[PDB]
């Protein structure tokens, strides 16, 4: 009635995004896999397979608890059924903090609903094998008992609607395959698997240090100056922060930012937190060290698990959450500080490195008004 | 129905008439707020006598279920307070030991209560219902706010039902309620006496060691390590500790999700098989005789030894309706492997508690045998 799927039909590309040149298509899988993988954090879901089928849907398999599926005495329905129905009961049933579910972006299965055609869910929970049927987000019939079952998870299989998604119909298989790594490098344990049943194709994403994983990816086609890549995952106050750097024979800063999966283009708190730290160590290092008074080459990665974020605007691309300065700087200040004297043949090059830079920077300005 | 309890009370909670019942009441509140701390969510237990003989119960956990049970169109927890059997089938857990007469939990008790109070603290509002003979007054309304959760139950026995003994006996209530945290380590269990302003707490981070520590006071230990450990492995939790005291008794208590099993069980079977293996197998290895390893197996009958072996099962089987037997057969494995294998460990981790505990077990068998040859020779 009140809250429902035909705001999302009237305006799709306010929810996932351009649905005429394949970018609202393909975030589509990415509202399905943040449903399934946000119970990750708490152990629930291990294990995410992402699969592209010949008839151009797309199915997202979990083993997380199963979606609840208790008939709500209020809606007279399954609870699955209501978030599938209600355009924001997912996000206001779920209790988890590092949920970024809003009011357009990050809505879930329920904006995914009603842009497909057809979806199929599945879910297996208490012993009991549960299957259920939309169309244009309407249900075929109630969430029935089909079987029964050892394994608990959910599975939601979609057709994307074609009075919705124009000019790109079909998955690219690397848009899907890019950011399922990108998720596997920001939760670490997390194990991700994308197959294609149109050609065979198959990819398995799990790595059990993400953060360090990331920067040997981003400088696979580079030359890291130092061995060693400087990395950490911690958590404090309910703040998650992992870091990996490394520097390359390159002179271009490439800083990656990240809040609870999302990226920001423009940085944050966290960026801020990251070069601030950054700043004090070398400094710190530099003095005591005999060293007389944007980086070049350097690849970085700053991933922050933080409950209820904030960010400057509807797009995330600045992380606005103050805490999070204090809850990145604190640790890098310790834990960089422990990584140049624990690793003095890194800490040489590097310092190296940027003076290197400093000399050259001050003699091209020199050389400027030479001629 | 609660109809068929007010009928034949001591069916279900014991006899009326000596206070065990009536103690037992107690017990059975207790025990719907324990199995709430093995899942994580209850942390403290108060258990509080007031002035007018009636007992309280506070925890720190979820909150019995308050929303409407939409086919009995009442709340959750008058559903499970009113009908019988629906405490034990709306709960999961299956350790939770619910008889279909012993263990029925707090319906049972609110049965043969003239009054029950329950408040319920859950999703930010304190919800309360009052029960009169197990008829609730009105349905479960809230009526406050709060940031905790958690259950309370006081209740006031029936004088119709209970005769001679009608007030709580502190002693009673202390000494179970200490067994249940020693049997339950990280749970706090505070005992409040209204009469007296009288109070106790209980609470062990090493409670399975700390049981033995407290049967081993007023006797002298001939080793100084005590023998323990705390395990799960495939649903079942096994915690033994053990202790050899100068003594010539042999007392191995024995627990199932803290029932006390008098006449011992699967658990005191595997108790007994590892204990043979082991000091059979340091024994064989130590050099000992053939005559001092007969000495040491022949009979199960350990002078000077203490111990207790308490057993979390998921849905245990009792030999009849008492419990005083646990037959569940996937027990005795469960105890019998984690000894076999930690006991071992112990034997040779501490070498100087394995000579002296050794050397105790044939002594006593060579007396014994020196006492039946003395008693043949005897003119
Ligand atoms: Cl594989
Ligand atoms: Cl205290
Ligand atoms: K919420
Ligand atoms: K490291
Ligand atoms: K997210
Ligand atoms: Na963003």
């Known amino acids: 009635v009140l809250k429902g799927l035909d705001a999302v039909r009237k305006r799709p590309g306010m929810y996932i995004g351009d649905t005429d040149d394949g970018t609202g298509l393909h975030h589509m899988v990415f509202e399905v896999v943040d449903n ?25 398999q979990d083993d997380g608890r ?10 007279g329905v399954s609870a699955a059924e ?44 208490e012993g009991k094998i549960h299957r259920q049927i939309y169309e244009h987000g309407v249900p075929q019939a109630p969430l029935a008992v089909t079987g029964e079952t050892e394994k608990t998870g959910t599975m939601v299989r979609f057709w994307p609607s074609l009075e919705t998604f124009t000019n790109v119909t079909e998955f690219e298989y690397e848009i899907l395959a890019k950011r399922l790594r990108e998720l596997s490098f920001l939760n670490s344990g997390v194990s991700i698997r994308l197959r294609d049943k149109r050609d065979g194709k198959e990819d398995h994403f799990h790595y059990e240090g993400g953060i360090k994983a990331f920067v040997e990816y981003l400088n696979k086609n580079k030359t890291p100056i130092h061995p060693n890549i400087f990395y950490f995952s911690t958590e404090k106050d309910g703040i998650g922060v992992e870091v990996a750097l490394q520097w390359n024979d390159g002179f271009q800063e490439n800083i990656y930012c990240f809040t609870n999966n999302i990226p920001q283009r423009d940085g944050g708190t966290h960026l801020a937190g990251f070069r601030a730290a950054m700043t004090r160590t070398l400094n710190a290092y530099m003095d005591k060290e005999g060293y007389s008074k944007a980086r070049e080459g350097l690849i970085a990665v700053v991933s ?47 310092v190296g490195k940027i003076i290197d830079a400093a000399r050259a920077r001050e003699a091209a300005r020199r050389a400027r008004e030479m001629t």
């Open 36 to 60: 399934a993988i946000d119970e990750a954090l708490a152990g629930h879901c291990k294990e995410i397979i992402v699969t592209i089928h010949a008839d151009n849907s797309v199915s997202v």
């Open 66 to 75: 199963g979606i609840p599926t208790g008939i709500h005495p209020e809606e």
């Open 82 to 125: 209501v978030i599938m129905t209600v355009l924001h009961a997912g996000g206001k049933f779920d209790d988890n903090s590092y949920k970024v579910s809003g009011g357009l972006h990050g809505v879930g299965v329920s904006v995914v609903n009603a842009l497909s055609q057809k979806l199929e869910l599945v879910i297996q929970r």
């Open 304 to 350: 922050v698990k933080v409950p209820d974020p904030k960010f400057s605007s509807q797009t995330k691309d600045k992380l606005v959450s103050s805490e999070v300065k204090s809850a990145v700087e604190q640790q890098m200040n310790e834990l960089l500080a422990e990584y140049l004297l624990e690793n003095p043949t890194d800490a040489k090059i590097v």
